[PDB]
Design a binder for this molecule. Sequence first.
Ligand code: HEM
Ligand SMILES: OC(Cn1cncn1)(Cn1cncn1)c1ccc(F)cc1F
Length: 441
Amino acid sequence: KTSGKGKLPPVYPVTVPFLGHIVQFGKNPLEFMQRCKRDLKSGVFTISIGGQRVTIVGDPHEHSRFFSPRNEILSPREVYTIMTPVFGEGVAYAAPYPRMREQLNFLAEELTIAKFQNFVPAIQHEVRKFMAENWKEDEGVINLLEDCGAMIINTACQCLFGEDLRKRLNARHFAQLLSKMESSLIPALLRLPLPQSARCREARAELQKILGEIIVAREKSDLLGGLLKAVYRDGTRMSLHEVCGMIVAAMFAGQHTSTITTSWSMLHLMHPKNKKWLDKLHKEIDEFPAQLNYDNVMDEMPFAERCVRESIRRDPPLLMVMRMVKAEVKVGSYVVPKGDIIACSPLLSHHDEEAFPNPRLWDPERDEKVDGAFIGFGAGVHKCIGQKFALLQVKTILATAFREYDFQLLRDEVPDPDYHTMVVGPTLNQCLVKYTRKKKL
Ligand code: HEM
Ligand SMILES: OC(Cn1cncn1)(Cn1cncn1)c1ccc(F)cc1F
């Protein structure tokens, strides 16, 4: 059972039992969680979605307690059921953890620092190719958020998709399918049974078929190829279904998190308030040639990476990460019982006054004042596997972009975090920016 002296973290009083806190938690979770933490004199607290127990680890010191326990204790599968139609049955979380671990490990091996051999030139190539087309005028106005999403997807494909695949699967067209597979991840039913999404099913099968054809044609380097060579610890290869899933996951995971990190970063540096930091950025990328190489970005862009880190810290794209509690776990002084859902919020954590004084301030030179406080890319057993690539990708984009362009916000102050989904980026209708082409002669 327990048992039986299991303590329980303070519960926040709900005005409406049936409602839960959803009405508030949606409008602005930050203020809400920040309020609970303050009033309950405890960084670790439990709130209820309607008729449900949810314990939030909002104490930076306690991140270990959340990220270190293995799936057997804290299981993510139950929470992320929703994504199964997207990743597929028996893929990722949907599958048993012994297999899941393997699947991800294979994807990881494909995004390792080892594979970045030509990635940089590939990225830099696609970026310029986009700027030339969509930013013709010497001085014009565009939407940064929409444009970063395009650069990200195009860039990623140039890296992880082979010549044959790209021509067959148009880069933009892939985002078309990717977007349809999400038309079902806009919740919006939690108490009732799960319904299938026609949009998602079709778009995935449309992608799976295409991929299927390439494999046949390929049968008389890229992520897809890398995945084919894959063999399990029992002597089994990944099926088309499983391969398609991993790729979809890789692209889904990257698209939204990176396009937001890239947007936020450009937005800060862009603001006159952050002129100083823009100067030290140019100190860094001015002496670089027009053609960047792996070394330039990986080992010669330290400040640039700091900007990206701080942008992820201040406004983490991933609101919370959650897991189903199967067994008792110790958290600080308190404890969380079986059956509950334990969450951990980068957003709340990154705003702890002790760990990040003045958390709404964008300071690329700030440091964890509590070791481990930053969980932008997760931690422990579930560390992000696309981190290294995301950074290479984002840093390279920042360079090419600020190498031959100057940007100016049309708004007064940096955009507001647009909280709706678990994924949070800058407010779309505020990401309008005027670009002016740098002087040449
Ligand atoms: C800046 C961009 C990115 C951010 C901010 C980010 C953030 C995160 C976070 C917070 C987690 C923790 C998930 C959890 O605790 O449940 C995570 C895990 C993960 N990420 Fe990312 N990520 C990024 C890019 C990517 C990319 C590009 C990929 C694939 C290409 C990727 C693949 C994964 C996978 C497979 C996991 C879970 C694996 C595990 O549980 O060990 N991520 N990421
Ligand atoms: O957990 C994510 C996506 N999901 C989790 N919370 C909200 N959506 C994070 N993802 C990883 N990097 C960026 N996003 C994930 C975990 C594993 C995975 F394979 C894909 C995937 F999106």
